[PDB]
Amino acid sequence: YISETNFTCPVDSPPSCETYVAYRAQSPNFLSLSNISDIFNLSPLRIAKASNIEAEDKKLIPDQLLLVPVTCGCTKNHSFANITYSIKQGDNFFILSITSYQNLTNYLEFKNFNPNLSPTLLPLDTKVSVPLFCKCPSKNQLNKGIKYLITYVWQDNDNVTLVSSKFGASQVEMLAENNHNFTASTNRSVLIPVTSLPKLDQP
C-alpha cells in the first residue's frame, strides 16, 4: 500500500459525503460512457454531466479524462466508495484493481473489502464490493471554497501545475492535502481539493 497520500477519514466534518473520482477512458473496453458506467452503477448521463461532455453517446479517446460521481463513506478510520460489481469471465480482484478500476483501488483493499470471498477464482455474476479511494473535506477546507476532494490517479510525468490547471484547483490547497512532491505516487491515487466541479476540456 505505497501511496503518499493519506485517505484517512475526517475528524472535523461529517463522515459520509458526495464527491468525484477521476477516470480515464481506456484503450479497448472503456471508450464509451455506457461501458464506464457499467462498473460504477450509474447512468452515463451523470458521467457526461460531471465530465462536462456535450454528446453522451460520443465515443471516447484513450486517456480522455472523466469525472464519475461517487458516495464517499468512512470505514475503520479509512474512507472508501463502496461500489457493487458483478464478476465476469476472467475477473479477479488484482486485475480489476489495475485495469477496470485503473488503480483507484488496491488489490489489498479490494480483498479486505470482501473477506469471505476469494480473490483469485470466483463464480460468474457474483457481486463484489469495490472500494475506491476518496475522502470528505475537513471543516477547515469547508470554510473556504472547497466542496470536493476529487480522487485522481497521478500519471507518469505529471506535475502540480498541469493537474491543478485541469481541475482549477489551488496548488497550495492541493499540496496541503497531500504533502509530498509527487515523486513516488505514479499510478497511485491522490486528492485534488476543488472549490467547484471543474469544466473539463472535452472534444
Ligand SMILES: *[C@@H]1O[C@H](CO)[C@@H](O[C@@H]2O[C@H](CO)[C@@H](O[C@@H]3O[C@H](CO)[C@@H](O)[C@H](O[C@H]4O[C@H](CO)[C@@H](O)[C@H](O)[C@@H]4O)[C@@H]3O)[C@H](O)[C@H]2NC(C)=O)[C@H](O)[C@H]1NC(C)=O
Ligand atoms: C496501474 O498501476 C500499475 C502499477 O502498479 C500499472 O502496471 C503496469 O501495467 C503494464 C501493463 O499491464 C505493465 O507493462 C508491461 O511491462 C512488462 C515488463 O514489465 C512488458 O513485458 C509488457 O510489454 C508488452 O507485452 C505484450 C507482448 O508480450 C505486448 O503486446 C503489450 O502491448 C505490452 O506492451 C508491458 O509493457 C507494467 O510493467 C506494469 N507496471 C508495474 C509496476 O506493475 C498499470 O498499468 C496501471 N493501470 C492503469 C490502467 O493505469
Ligand SMILES: *[C@@H]1O[C@H](CO)[C@@H](O[C@@H]2O[C@H](CO)[C@@H](O[C@@H]3O[C@H](CO)[C@@H](O)[C@H](O)[C@@H]3O)[C@H](O)[C@H]2NC(C)=O)[C@H](O)[C@H]1NC(C)=O
Ligand atoms: C464495451 O465493452 C464491451 C465488453 O467489455 C466491448 O465488447 C467487445 O466488442 C468487441 C468488438 O467491438 C468484440 O470483439 C468481437 O469478437 C467476436 C467474437 O466473439 C467477433 O465475431 C467480432 O467480429 C468482434 O471482433 C468483443 O468480443 C467484445 N467483448 C465482450 C466481452 O463482449 C465493447 O467493444 C466496448 N465498447 C466500447 C465503445 O468501449
Ligand SMILES: *[C@@H]1O[C@H](CO)[C@@H](O[C@@H]2O[C@H](CO)[C@@H](O)[C@H](O)[C@H]2NC(C)=O)[C@H](O)[C@H]1NC(C)=O
Ligand atoms: C457495500 O454495500 C453492500 C450493499 O450495497 C453491503 O452489503 C449489504 O449489507 C446489508 C447489511 O445487512 C445486507 O442486508 C445486504 O444484503 C448486503 N448486500 C449484499 C451483500 O449484496 C456491504 O456490506 C457494503 N460493504 C461495506 C464494506 O460497507
Ligand SMILES: *[C@@H]1O[C@H](CO)[C@@H](O[C@@H]2O[C@H](CO)[C@@H](O)[C@H](O)[C@H]2NC(C)=O)[C@H](O)[C@H]1NC(C)=O
Ligand atoms: C504506470 O503505468 C504505465 C502504463 O499505463 C506504465 O507504462 C508502461 O511501462 C512498461 C515498462 O516500461 C512499458 O513496456 C509500456 O510500454 C509502458 N506504457 C506506456 C509507455 O504507455 C508505467 O511503467 C507505470 N509506472 C509505474 C511507476 O508503475
Ligand SMILES: *[C@@H]1O[C@H](CO)[C@@H](O)[C@H](O)[C@H]1NC(C)=O
Ligand atoms: C500520513 O501522514 C503522516 C504525517 O506525517 C505521514 O505518515 C505521511 O505524511 C502520510 N502518509 C503517507 C503514506 O504519505
Ligand SMILES: *[C@@H]1O[C@H](CO)[C@@H](O)[C@H](O)[C@H]1NC(C)=O
Ligand atoms: C511536468 O512535470 C514533470 C516532472 O514531474 C516534467 O518532467 C515535465 O516536463 C512537466 N511538464 C510540463 C509541460 O511542464
